[PDB]
Write a protein that binds this ligand. Sequence first.
Ligand SMILES: Nc1ncnc2c1ncn2[C@@H]1O[C@H](COP(=O)(O)OP(=O)(O)O)[C@@H](O)[C@H]1O
Ligand SMILES: [Mg+2]
Length: 232
Amino acid sequence: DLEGTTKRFEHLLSLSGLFKHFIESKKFRQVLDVLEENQFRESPAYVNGQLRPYQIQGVNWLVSLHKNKIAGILADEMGLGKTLQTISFLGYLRYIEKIPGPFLVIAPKSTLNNWLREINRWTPDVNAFILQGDKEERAELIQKKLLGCDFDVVIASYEIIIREKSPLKKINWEYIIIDEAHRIKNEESMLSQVLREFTSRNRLLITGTPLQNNLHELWALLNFLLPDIFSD
DNA sequence: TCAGGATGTATATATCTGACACGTGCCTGGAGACTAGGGAGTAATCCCCTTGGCGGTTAAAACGCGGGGGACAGCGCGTACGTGCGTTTAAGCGCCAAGGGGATTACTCCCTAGTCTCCAGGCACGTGTCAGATATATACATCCGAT
Ligand SMILES: Nc1ncnc2c1ncn2[C@@H]1O[C@H](COP(=O)(O)OP(=O)(O)O)[C@@H](O)[C@H]1O
Ligand SMILES: [Mg+2]
């Protein structure tokens, strides 16, 4: 809790810590009152295939954010290969960090199967167990796989996560990802409301249009990744 | 009948969200004079209602009979509902956008009500009447039960 909570603070102050408004105003005041006195440049191929030069630093940015243990949103534009740049990071955890699964692949219904198609083409031998279908084929799939604790990559749609919450609510998670995250722009939206209760270390959000309506929507995205940091 | 199905029916678990308990203040109910007018009690007058009995007229009501036709029981029968299975289709559920509608919440005034003060003139009551609605009779024309 506080070991990461404190460490993130001066790390924000470390890399251009020019905030000086909410880093100190934020009940974390007494927590920081204690301290108030004071890399894959080779297009690596652990995941199969070659990575074009401008795609790597994004992964290292994810790696650096992971190595610093803070969540981050990427804002690659449409058609730029966010799919590859997403699964590559998970390969980093599986290969370099040796932490395979569990993770979610919360995505639109249209792209449910699409990522799995792209998942295998750069990283075969993966545990992708998409949860989709009628009331039945989903149901028995819960016990054998979701309740079997034998997965690393879980694919489920916006509508699914609001249905199969009770299984996934029990399961602890490391990371949770949402593609085309802008549907989380109303912080009282029931899907956004449900995701508050999902236990995870950090979260990843993929978007191309973070700011669409106001600047108030950005904080709702920020309230999701780092609720402690912004919280208002 | 009995075994084959299909259908409620108890039962344990996990979820949750709705009922309940708790602190604040502000607003309303309570204490306490002060007063006036509604209502309780009284007296007087007159019309209606009671209880028990009597006498009379005269239509309705009670009773019996006979005969028809309407009811209720059966017998087909041929639909028109049921039951079941497959498959679309729409209800419901989320989400996006911007407004207007509305309900407090808080001052201001205008004006339009209530209150009083006379004072005439509407209206209710007690008097005639005569015109409309009776009851009478009769001729008729108009349905109903047998050829
Ligand atoms: N380094 C690469 N080499 C070859 N193809 C790539 C590379 N990076 C991305 N792609 C392809 O470009 C496509 C871009 O898709 P993307 O925009 O990530 O989809 P989405 O918008 O649904 O996330 C992907 O389907 C992927 O196959
Ligand atoms: Mg995409």
